[PDB]
Short mmCIF file of C-alpha atoms and ligand atoms in Angstrom, two decimals:
data_model
loop_
_atom_site.label_atom_id
_atom_site.label_comp_id
_atom_site.label_asym_id
_atom_site.label_seq_id
_atom_site.Cartn_x
_atom_site.Cartn_y
_atom_site.Cartn_z
CA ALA A 1 0.25 0.58 0.31
CA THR A 2 2.69 2.71 -1.18
CA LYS A 3 1.39 6.68 -1.03
CA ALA A 4 3.15 9.48 -2.60
CA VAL A 5 1.86 12.86 -3.15
CA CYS A 6 3.09 16.17 -5.75
CA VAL A 7 2.31 19.60 -4.45
CA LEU A 8 1.91 21.34 -7.68
CA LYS A 9 3.23 25.40 -8.83
CA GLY A 10 4.00 27.33 -11.55
CA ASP A 11 4.79 30.68 -12.58
CA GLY A 12 0.94 31.96 -12.68
CA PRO A 13 -1.96 31.28 -10.13
CA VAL A 14 -2.01 27.37 -10.61
CA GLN A 15 -1.51 25.57 -6.95
CA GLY A 16 -2.51 22.78 -6.18
CA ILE A 17 -1.38 19.15 -4.10
CA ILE A 18 -1.86 15.53 -6.32
CA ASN A 19 -2.11 12.44 -4.10
CA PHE A 20 -1.41 8.64 -5.08
CA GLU A 21 -2.09 5.35 -3.32
CA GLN A 22 -1.96 2.40 -4.89
CA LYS A 23 -3.12 -0.86 -2.03
CA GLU A 24 -1.39 -3.40 -4.61
CA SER A 25 2.04 -2.90 -6.03
CA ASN A 26 -0.16 -5.29 -8.83
CA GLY A 27 -2.53 -2.75 -8.70
CA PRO A 28 -4.67 0.19 -10.65
CA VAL A 29 -3.18 4.39 -9.22
CA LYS A 30 -6.32 6.06 -7.43
CA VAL A 31 -4.69 9.86 -7.97
CA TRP A 32 -7.14 12.94 -6.36
CA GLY A 33 -5.94 15.86 -4.59
CA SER A 34 -7.62 19.62 -5.56
CA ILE A 35 -6.05 22.01 -8.36
CA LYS A 36 -6.99 25.82 -8.49
CA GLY A 37 -6.01 28.61 -9.56
CA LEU A 38 -6.41 27.47 -13.81
CA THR A 39 -9.00 28.29 -16.48
CA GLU A 40 -12.49 26.37 -16.76
CA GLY A 41 -12.63 23.01 -18.76
CA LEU A 42 -9.74 20.63 -20.45
CA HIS A 43 -5.87 20.40 -19.52
CA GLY A 44 -3.78 18.64 -19.53
CA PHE A 45 -2.23 15.93 -16.79
CA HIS A 46 0.74 14.40 -17.19
CA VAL A 47 3.95 12.37 -15.66
CA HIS A 48 6.67 13.56 -17.11
CA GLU A 49 10.31 11.58 -17.23
CA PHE A 50 12.16 13.96 -15.07
CA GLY A 51 12.08 15.02 -11.18
CA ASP A 52 14.05 18.04 -12.15
CA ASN A 53 12.88 21.61 -11.42
CA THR A 54 16.58 23.13 -12.18
CA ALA A 55 15.58 25.00 -15.00
CA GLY A 56 11.73 25.07 -14.03
CA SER A 57 8.67 22.86 -15.01
CA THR A 58 11.05 22.90 -18.51
CA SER A 59 14.07 20.22 -17.16
CA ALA A 60 11.66 18.03 -16.38
CA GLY A 61 11.60 16.21 -20.57
CA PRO A 62 8.80 14.90 -22.08
CA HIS A 63 6.35 12.14 -21.16
CA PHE A 64 7.53 9.34 -19.61
CA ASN A 65 7.74 6.73 -22.13
CA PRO A 66 9.44 3.77 -20.91
CA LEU A 67 7.74 2.07 -23.74
CA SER A 68 9.23 3.83 -26.55
CA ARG A 69 5.18 4.27 -26.94
CA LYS A 70 2.95 6.75 -29.17
CA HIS A 71 1.05 9.17 -27.33
CA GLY A 72 -2.32 8.45 -26.74
CA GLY A 73 -5.38 8.60 -23.56
CA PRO A 74 -5.21 6.57 -20.24
CA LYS A 75 -7.71 4.87 -22.53
CA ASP A 76 -6.01 4.04 -25.34
CA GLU A 77 -3.35 0.35 -25.23
CA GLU A 78 -0.73 3.22 -27.86
CA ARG A 79 0.21 5.07 -24.79
CA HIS A 80 3.27 6.86 -22.71
CA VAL A 81 2.78 5.63 -19.20
CA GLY A 82 2.99 9.12 -17.93
CA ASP A 83 -0.45 9.75 -20.16
CA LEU A 84 -3.31 11.41 -17.65
CA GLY A 85 -5.26 12.45 -20.40
CA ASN A 86 -7.16 15.89 -18.83
CA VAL A 87 -9.13 17.56 -15.86
CA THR A 88 -11.76 19.53 -15.66
CA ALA A 89 -11.59 23.06 -14.11
CA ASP A 90 -14.69 23.97 -12.42
CA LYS A 91 -16.56 27.76 -13.07
CA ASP A 92 -14.64 28.91 -10.24
CA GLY A 93 -10.91 27.32 -11.66
CA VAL A 94 -11.21 24.39 -9.59
CA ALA A 95 -9.90 20.68 -10.42
CA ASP A 96 -11.24 18.29 -8.24
CA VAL A 97 -8.54 15.45 -9.56
CA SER A 98 -10.22 12.22 -9.71
CA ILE A 99 -8.81 9.16 -11.90
CA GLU A 100 -7.99 5.20 -11.29
CA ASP A 101 -4.91 4.38 -14.08
CA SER A 102 -2.65 0.80 -14.27
CA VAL A 103 -0.34 2.06 -16.46
CA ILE A 104 1.14 4.90 -13.99
CA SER A 105 2.50 2.80 -11.15
CA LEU A 106 3.65 3.78 -7.27
CA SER A 107 6.67 1.17 -7.98
CA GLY A 108 9.08 -1.62 -10.30
CA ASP A 109 9.58 -0.16 -14.28
CA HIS A 110 6.79 2.04 -14.32
CA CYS A 111 7.08 3.63 -11.49
CA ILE A 112 6.43 7.36 -11.37
CA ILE A 113 8.13 7.97 -7.88
CA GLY A 114 10.88 11.03 -8.68
CA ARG A 115 9.85 12.21 -11.47
CA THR A 116 7.32 15.69 -12.59
CA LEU A 117 3.95 15.62 -12.92
CA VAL A 118 2.66 18.57 -15.05
CA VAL A 119 -0.73 20.06 -15.71
CA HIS A 120 -0.93 21.76 -18.55
CA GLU A 121 -2.59 25.11 -19.98
CA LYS A 122 -4.70 23.85 -22.70
CA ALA A 123 -6.40 19.69 -23.19
CA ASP A 124 -4.57 17.21 -24.23
CA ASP A 125 -6.31 15.80 -27.30
CA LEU A 126 -5.52 12.54 -26.93
CA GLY A 127 -3.43 11.70 -29.98
CA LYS A 128 -5.85 12.18 -32.62
CA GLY A 129 -5.38 16.11 -34.13
CA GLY A 130 -4.02 14.93 -36.99
CA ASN A 131 -0.26 16.11 -36.64
CA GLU A 132 2.77 15.35 -35.84
CA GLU A 133 2.92 16.86 -32.08
CA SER A 134 -0.53 15.16 -31.71
CA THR A 135 1.66 11.54 -30.70
CA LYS A 136 4.05 13.87 -28.81
CA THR A 137 2.35 15.19 -26.95
CA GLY A 138 -1.37 15.64 -27.49
CA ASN A 139 -0.71 19.64 -27.74
CA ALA A 140 -2.05 20.39 -24.57
CA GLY A 141 0.69 23.43 -24.68
CA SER A 142 2.20 25.52 -21.95
CA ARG A 143 3.35 24.27 -18.21
CA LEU A 144 1.27 25.44 -15.59
CA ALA A 145 1.93 24.33 -13.07
CA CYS A 146 4.40 20.80 -11.58
CA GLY A 147 6.28 19.32 -8.87
CA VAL A 148 8.12 15.66 -7.96
CA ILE A 149 6.08 13.16 -7.13
CA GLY A 150 6.79 11.84 -3.56
CA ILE A 151 7.13 8.96 -1.39
CA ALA A 152 4.37 9.89 0.88
CA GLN A 153 3.41 8.37 4.92
CA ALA B 1 25.18 6.61 -14.43
CA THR B 2 21.62 6.65 -11.66
CA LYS B 3 21.54 10.32 -11.71
CA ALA B 4 18.97 12.12 -9.30
CA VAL B 5 18.98 16.01 -8.10
CA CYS B 6 17.22 18.12 -5.56
CA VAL B 7 16.02 21.87 -6.18
CA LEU B 8 16.23 22.91 -2.49
CA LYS B 9 14.04 26.14 -1.38
CA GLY B 10 12.60 27.28 1.59
CA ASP B 11 10.47 30.64 3.01
CA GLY B 12 13.83 33.15 3.62
CA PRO B 13 16.95 33.01 1.00
CA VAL B 14 18.28 30.07 1.64
CA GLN B 15 18.24 28.39 -1.68
CA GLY B 16 20.33 25.51 -3.74
CA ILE B 17 20.80 22.55 -6.16
CA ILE B 18 22.45 19.41 -4.95
CA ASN B 19 23.34 16.47 -8.08
CA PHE B 20 23.71 13.00 -7.08
CA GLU B 21 25.87 10.93 -9.38
CA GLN B 22 26.36 7.27 -8.49
CA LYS B 23 27.23 5.12 -12.31
CA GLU B 24 27.44 1.67 -10.26
CA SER B 25 24.52 0.51 -8.48
CA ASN B 26 26.89 -1.27 -6.29
CA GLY B 27 28.65 1.47 -5.54
CA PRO B 28 28.86 5.38 -4.12
CA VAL B 29 27.48 7.77 -4.39
CA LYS B 30 28.42 11.10 -5.09
CA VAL B 31 26.51 14.88 -4.18
CA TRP B 32 27.81 18.09 -5.38
CA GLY B 33 26.16 21.39 -5.82
CA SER B 34 25.94 25.11 -4.56
CA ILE B 35 23.50 26.43 -1.31
CA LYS B 36 23.50 30.08 -1.15
CA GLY B 37 21.91 32.77 1.91
CA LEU B 38 23.59 30.64 4.36
CA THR B 39 25.11 31.33 7.77
CA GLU B 40 28.40 31.14 7.88
CA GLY B 41 29.26 28.15 9.00
CA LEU B 42 28.04 24.49 9.87
CA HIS B 43 24.66 23.80 8.58
CA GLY B 44 23.01 20.21 9.02
CA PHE B 45 22.31 18.63 5.97
CA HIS B 46 19.66 15.44 5.77
CA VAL B 47 17.28 13.38 3.55
CA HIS B 48 14.62 13.27 5.62
CA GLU B 49 11.90 10.08 5.16
CA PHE B 50 9.24 11.45 2.86
CA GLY B 51 8.35 13.54 -0.19
CA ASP B 52 6.03 16.16 0.70
CA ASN B 53 5.28 19.51 0.92
CA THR B 54 2.05 19.95 1.59
CA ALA B 55 3.13 21.21 4.84
CA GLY B 56 6.15 23.19 4.02
CA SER B 57 9.60 21.69 5.27
CA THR B 58 7.41 19.98 8.31
CA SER B 59 6.17 17.10 6.59
CA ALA B 60 9.18 15.39 5.04
CA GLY B 61 8.69 13.90 8.27
CA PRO B 62 12.09 12.45 10.65
CA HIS B 63 15.64 11.37 8.69
CA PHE B 64 15.31 9.01 6.39
CA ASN B 65 16.13 5.22 8.26
CA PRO B 66 15.36 2.19 7.43
CA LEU B 67 17.59 0.25 9.16
CA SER B 68 15.38 1.33 12.18
CA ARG B 69 19.71 3.20 14.20
CA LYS B 70 20.74 6.04 16.37
CA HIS B 71 21.36 8.98 14.22
CA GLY B 72 25.01 10.46 13.72
CA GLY B 73 27.14 11.56 11.33
CA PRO B 74 28.31 9.76 7.60
CA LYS B 75 31.17 8.53 9.49
CA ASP B 76 29.71 6.74 11.93
CA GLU B 77 28.57 2.97 11.26
CA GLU B 78 25.56 4.40 13.94
CA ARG B 79 24.09 6.01 11.98
CA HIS B 80 20.24 6.87 9.93
CA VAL B 81 21.29 6.79 6.35
CA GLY B 82 19.61 10.03 6.02
CA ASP B 83 22.85 10.79 8.40
CA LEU B 84 24.51 13.13 6.31
CA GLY B 85 26.26 15.43 8.49
CA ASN B 86 27.07 18.99 8.38
CA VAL B 87 27.62 21.29 4.80
CA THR B 88 30.46 24.63 5.08
CA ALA B 89 29.08 27.91 4.27
CA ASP B 90 32.18 30.53 3.26
CA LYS B 91 31.66 34.21 4.87
CA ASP B 92 30.05 35.05 1.82
CA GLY B 93 27.30 32.51 2.94
CA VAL B 94 27.05 30.05 -0.27
CA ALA B 95 28.20 26.61 0.69
CA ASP B 96 30.22 24.31 -1.69
CA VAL B 97 28.83 21.07 -1.37
CA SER B 98 31.26 18.68 -2.03
CA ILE B 99 30.15 14.64 -0.73
CA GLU B 100 30.68 11.01 -1.81
CA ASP B 101 28.55 8.59 0.37
CA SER B 102 27.85 4.64 0.31
CA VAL B 103 25.17 4.84 2.73
CA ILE B 104 22.80 6.11 1.04
CA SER B 105 20.95 4.91 -2.70
CA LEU B 106 19.74 6.01 -5.99
CA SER B 107 18.50 2.57 -6.54
CA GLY B 108 17.19 -0.50 -3.81
CA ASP B 109 16.02 -0.30 0.19
CA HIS B 110 18.07 2.81 0.28
CA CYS B 111 16.93 4.39 -2.53
CA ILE B 112 16.91 8.25 -0.89
CA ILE B 113 14.86 8.91 -4.82
CA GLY B 114 11.35 10.08 -3.95
CA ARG B 115 12.90 11.60 -0.54
CA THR B 116 13.15 15.02 0.97
CA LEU B 117 16.66 17.08 1.16
CA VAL B 118 16.87 19.49 4.14
CA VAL B 119 19.05 21.93 4.67
CA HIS B 120 19.08 23.20 8.26
CA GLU B 121 19.04 26.34 10.32
CA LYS B 122 22.41 24.96 12.80
CA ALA B 123 24.89 22.02 13.02
CA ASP B 124 24.47 19.02 13.21
CA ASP B 125 26.50 17.79 16.29
CA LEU B 126 27.19 14.19 14.84
CA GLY B 127 24.91 12.17 17.85
CA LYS B 128 26.80 13.31 20.27
CA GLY B 129 25.18 16.77 21.85
CA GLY B 130 24.43 14.58 25.00
CA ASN B 131 20.70 14.72 25.31
CA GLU B 132 18.06 12.95 23.89
CA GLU B 133 17.58 14.59 20.39
CA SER B 134 21.45 14.25 19.53
CA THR B 135 20.60 10.43 19.04
CA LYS B 136 17.32 11.49 16.29
CA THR B 137 17.71 15.19 14.85
CA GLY B 138 21.74 16.19 15.72
CA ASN B 139 20.00 19.12 17.27
CA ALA B 140 20.92 20.78 13.41
CA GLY B 141 17.33 23.91 14.34
CA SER B 142 15.10 24.39 11.94
CA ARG B 143 14.47 23.49 8.34
CA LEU B 144 15.68 26.22 6.03
CA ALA B 145 15.32 24.81 2.40
CA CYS B 146 14.44 21.21 1.53
CA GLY B 147 13.54 19.53 -2.54
CA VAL B 148 11.93 16.42 -3.37
CA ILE B 149 15.15 14.00 -4.73
CA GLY B 150 14.18 13.50 -8.50
CA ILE B 151 15.02 11.60 -11.34
CA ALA B 152 17.50 13.35 -13.88
CA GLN B 153 19.22 13.18 -17.02
ZN1 ZN C 201 2.66 17.33 -20.24
ZN1 ZN C 202 2.12 11.20 -23.62
ZN1 ZN C 203 16.78 17.28 9.24
ZN1 ZN C 204 20.02 11.08 11.21
#
């Protein structure tokens, strides 16, 4: 029953705390928390490869992708491990994240501990945009906030 | 070579960047970087258990101690895995860090990825202080800056 947690911060108003819980090593990860300061609507939500914040969110590298696959949505078989899809911010700018994913893990080679959670400026097109960028980043625009995923009590 | 990085930050002027490198999974970890904004002299320098920054530095928990030992300095046989002793700040308040350690690791059971690196108000007394707290924290006083230890490129 490992746990992890991530504090999201950036240059702008997006601030949040995201929790991870995985009761069994072979099991689904529950991802939940509140993010505020977001524009209303959809925002791309990814684990990027490096837990490196030295040059801000830009040093976090690309989507966490140990199987060298193409970018998709969390329901797709063809996706990056870090592809968690979108979160939705309400009219007050609050996204109450609630996600369950079976591809990220808190252990083994899909481990995301020590990597960077990023919430994005726009919607992830889940790889359905018809351009090369769609199958790379999902066209979710800029990295509005980020933080390193840490082991939690 | 496994690599890791930590960006140390806090409420005041103390901030810095610490890098970690471990060429061999069963070899020592080299630790180097720079911290500025410090009072001249000795400052405790610890890996704390949790990569949890939700309540600032205080949620980081106690020193990382997977073998349940007593607190000491890094050369001691009786030490926490997280006990990296002290860094030294010059008259300009810059601590140039350059350490090698064989107890911390970037993989496996002693793995510090996803935990919290902390730099402290005062000297770590290396467990030679003579009170209870010496055997736990080293009496290094406040947590001035911290960061989660992240996987680096
Ligand atoms: Zn992204
Ligand atoms: Zn992706
Ligand atoms: Zn400490
Ligand atoms: Zn200790």
